[PDB]
Ligand binder design. Structure first.
Ligand SMILES: CC1=C(/C=C/C(C)=C/C=C/C(C)=C/CO)C(C)(C)CCC1
Ligand code: NA
Length: 134
């Protein structure tokens, strides 16, 4: 199916402040986070994926099997714990992060040579787009 493997650089990041505000991230950290332009480093073998969000401040590592619920420790972000499931939805990845915040999750997919990531919480939608360096 779709292989997201790649070192992806951020081109677009819309509404990230609002998204972090909804996660109750403190103003200080939001200030910094919004100028980080994290890379996405993905290594995938079928339904097994490691997704590393990389920045000079902090990294965030996801390591999961598509379709299989797991205990997600969002330490360094909002330091919350979710019961998270990343599922196939055709060629898209659909992540649901069950926990304190309503409607928390994200959708990831490829359009041509672009990786699209939409992150959501409580009706806030942050839009990110990434590209590999050719
Ligand atoms: C706030 C904050 C950060 C937030 C990272 C986030 C919110 C990553 C979401 C990654 C996803 C949804 C990958 C799915 O392919 C990072 C840790 C960069 C630096 C410290 C500040
Ligand atoms: Na692992």
């Amino acid at each position: 199916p779709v292989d997201f493997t790649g070192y992806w650089k951020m081109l677009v990041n819309e509404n990230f402040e609002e998204y972090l505000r909804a996660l109750d991230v403190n103003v200080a950290l939001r200030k910094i986070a919004n100028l980080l332009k994290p890379d996405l480093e993905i290594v995938q073998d079928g339904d097994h994926m490691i997704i590393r969000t990389l920045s000079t401040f902090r990294n965030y590592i996801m390591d999961f099997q598509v379709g299989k619920e797991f205990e997600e420790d969002l330490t360094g972000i909002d330091d919350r714990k979710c019961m998270t499931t990343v599922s196939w939805d055709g060629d898209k990845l659909q992540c649901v992060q069950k926990g304190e915040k309503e409607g928390r999750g994200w959708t990831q997919w490829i359009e041509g040579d672009e990786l699209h990531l939409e992150m959501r919480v409580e009706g806030v939608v942050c839009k990110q787009v990434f590209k590999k360096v050719q």
